[PDB]
Scaffold this active site. Structure first.
Site, PDB file in Angstrom:
ATOM      1  N   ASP A 256      -5.916   5.777  62.427  1.00 18.91           N
ATOM      2  CA  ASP A 256      -5.981   6.180  60.888  1.00 18.91           C
ATOM      3  C   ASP A 256      -5.112   6.752  60.617  1.00 18.91           C
ATOM      4  O   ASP A 256      -5.494   7.950  60.524  1.00 18.91           O
ATOM      5  CB  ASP A 256      -7.711   7.187  61.647  1.00 18.91           C
TER       6      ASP A 256
HETATM    7  C1  LIG Z   1     -12.587   3.048  53.250  1.00 18.18           C
HETATM    8  C2  LIG Z   1     -13.460   2.095  53.532  1.00 18.18           C
HETATM    9  C3  LIG Z   1     -12.687   1.005  54.005  1.00 18.18           C
HETATM   10  C4  LIG Z   1     -14.513   2.449  54.825  1.00 18.18           C
HETATM   11  C5  LIG Z   1     -15.410   1.496  54.581  1.00 18.18           C
HETATM   12  N1  LIG Z   1     -14.363   2.356  55.673  1.00 18.18           N
HETATM   13  C6  LIG Z   1     -13.622   3.949  56.220  1.00 18.18           C
HETATM   14  O1  LIG Z   1     -14.093   4.743  55.566  1.00 18.18           O
HETATM   15  C7  LIG Z   1     -13.097   4.102  57.577  1.00 18.18           C
HETATM   16  N2  LIG Z   1     -12.021   5.461  57.943  1.00 18.18           N
HETATM   17  C8  LIG Z   1     -10.916   5.341  57.191  1.00 18.18           C
HETATM   18  O2  LIG Z   1     -10.621   4.619  56.633  1.00 18.18           O
HETATM   19  C9  LIG Z   1     -10.077   6.650  57.035  1.00 18.18           C
HETATM   20  O3  LIG Z   1      -9.158   6.239  56.809  1.00 18.18           O
HETATM   21  C10 LIG Z   1     -11.067   7.905  55.529  1.00 18.18           C
HETATM   22  C11 LIG Z   1     -10.361   7.221  54.290  1.00 18.18           C
HETATM   23  C12 LIG Z   1     -11.049   7.750  52.920  1.00 18.18           C
HETATM   24  C13 LIG Z   1     -11.170   9.747  53.334  1.00 18.18           C
HETATM   25  C14 LIG Z   1     -11.434  10.443  51.749  1.00 18.18           C
HETATM   26  C15 LIG Z   1     -12.622   9.234  50.913  1.00 18.18           C
HETATM   27  C16 LIG Z   1     -12.556   7.382  51.201  1.00 18.18           C
HETATM   28  C17 LIG Z   1     -12.128   7.542  52.713  1.00 18.18           C
HETATM   29  N3  LIG Z   1     -10.588   8.769  56.138  1.00 18.18           N
HETATM   30  C18 LIG Z   1     -11.447  10.457  56.691  1.00 18.18           C
HETATM   31  O4  LIG Z   1     -12.847   9.609  56.223  1.00 18.18           O
HETATM   32  C19 LIG Z   1     -10.779  11.366  56.921  1.00 18.18           C
HETATM   33  N4  LIG Z   1     -11.392  12.289  55.632  1.00 18.18           N
HETATM   34  C20 LIG Z   1     -10.042  13.107  55.119  1.00 18.18           C
HETATM   35  O5  LIG Z   1      -9.029  12.766  55.561  1.00 18.18           O
HETATM   36  C21 LIG Z   1     -10.235  13.863  53.771  1.00 18.18           C
HETATM   37  N5  LIG Z   1      -9.359  15.038  53.998  1.00 18.18           N
HETATM   38  C22 LIG Z   1      -9.693  13.357  52.532  1.00 18.18           C
HETATM   39  C23 LIG Z   1     -10.647  13.972  51.226  1.00 18.18           C
HETATM   40  C24 LIG Z   1      -9.922  13.085  49.383  1.00 18.18           C
HETATM   41  C25 LIG Z   1      -8.775  11.949  49.895  1.00 18.18           C
HETATM   42  C26 LIG Z   1      -7.939  12.104  51.511  1.00 18.18           C
HETATM   43  C27 LIG Z   1      -8.185  12.323  52.496  1.00 18.18           C
HETATM   44  C28 LIG Z   1     -11.827  11.715  58.021  1.00 18.18           C
HETATM   45  C29 LIG Z   1     -12.991  12.219  58.025  1.00 18.18           C
HETATM   46  C30 LIG Z   1     -11.145  10.842  59.529  1.00 18.18           C
HETATM   47  C31 LIG Z   1     -10.503  12.559  58.589  1.00 18.18           C
HETATM   48  C32 LIG Z   1     -11.949   6.555  58.823  1.00 18.18           C
HETATM   49  S1  LIG Z   1     -14.090   6.618  59.296  1.00 18.18           S
HETATM   50  C33 LIG Z   1     -14.063   4.368  59.120  1.00 18.18           C
HETATM   51  C34 LIG Z   1     -15.424   3.456  58.861  1.00 18.18           C
HETATM   52  C35 LIG Z   1     -13.361   3.864  60.249  1.00 18.18           C
END
Ligand SMILES: CC(C)[C@@H](C)NC(=O)[C@H]1N(C(=O)[C@@H](O)[C@H](Cc2ccccc2)NC(=O)[C@@H](NC(=O)[C@@H](N)c2ccccc2)C(C)(C)C)CSC1(C)C
EC number: 3.4.23.-
Lengths: 116, 116
Positions: free
Chosen positions: B32
């Site tokens: 990721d």
């Molecule tokens: C983005 C959408 C398509 C959503 C449905 N999908 C997802 O979210 C998928 N993920 C992703 O797509 C990840 O790369 C996300 C991207 C993201 C970061 C901040 C706000 C909104 C989205 N990253 C995170 O959630 C991560 N948060 C962070 O890295 C956090 N420090 C942050 C806060 C504000 C701006 C950049 C980073 C952690 C919890 C995994 C460390 C992790 S969980 C998942 C379901 C596999």
């Protein structure tokens, strides 16, 4: 380009996004291999256009409210590539103004992860 | 190796993870580039382990309780490398036991994004 990966520095690109509801704008977007679908800020769309309700599960919990779904395809131009990315649909951030390039767009880029 | 990017297929990897609180275990993690920090399941730890409280912003919201921080470094072995990745700290998913390799780990791998 080859884009290095560093916990301290978010992997970002400038992209020209055309929602087909207003004028195309260039925005800074996160490059995100963990994202199934691309996310565009609502500010890029006209006040009136129809969007679809949607439910999204991510790190902070499940939300029925924060994202919508587009009704028209979205066109994306990335600086190095003359051919525009065409997304049948993506997500629309109604709140936090997030711009996130997901695997739907990276696929049409021929983007890869490389680990030596 | 070269991991292709597909909205229909999550880029996942087998990773031997050592919490230093029991023996090394195998999990399936999402690779990721949008993750600042690595996320591992609470299921790897026994009931009584000292973890720190932490606040985490994701797409589902801000959460002060789904995730904890490890007290000790986490050691991570990937199939294609001999040297372990040692993370000084990382995120622990107490809620959904997710497994996510982030940029902290990917930096120690010399992982890159490549867009032609
Ligand atoms: C983005 C959408 C398509 C959503 C449905 N999908 C997802 O979210 C998928 N993920 C992703 O797509 C990840 O790369 C996300 C991207 C993201 C970061 C901040 C706000 C909104 C989205 N990253 C995170 O959630 C991560 N948060 C962070 O890295 C956090 N420090 C942050 C806060 C504000 C701006 C950049 C980073 C952690 C919890 C995994 C460390 C992790 S969980 C998942 C379901 C596999």
């Amino acid at each position: 380009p080859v884009i290095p990966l560093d916990p301290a520095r978010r992997p970002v690109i400038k992209a020209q996004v055309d929602t087909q509801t207003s004028h195309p704008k260039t925005i800074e977007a996160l490059l995100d291999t963990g994202a199934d679908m691309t996310v565009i800020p609502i500010a890029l769309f006209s006040s009136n256009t129809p969007l679809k309700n949607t439910s999204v599960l991510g790190a902070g919990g499940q939300t029925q409210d924060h994202f919508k779904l587009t009704s028209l395809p979205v066109l994306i131009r990335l600086p190095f590539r003359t051919t525009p990315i065409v997304l049948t649909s993506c997500l629309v951030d109604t709140k936090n103004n997030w711009a996130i390039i997901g695997r739907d767009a990276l696929q049409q880029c021929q983007g890869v992860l490389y680990l030596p």
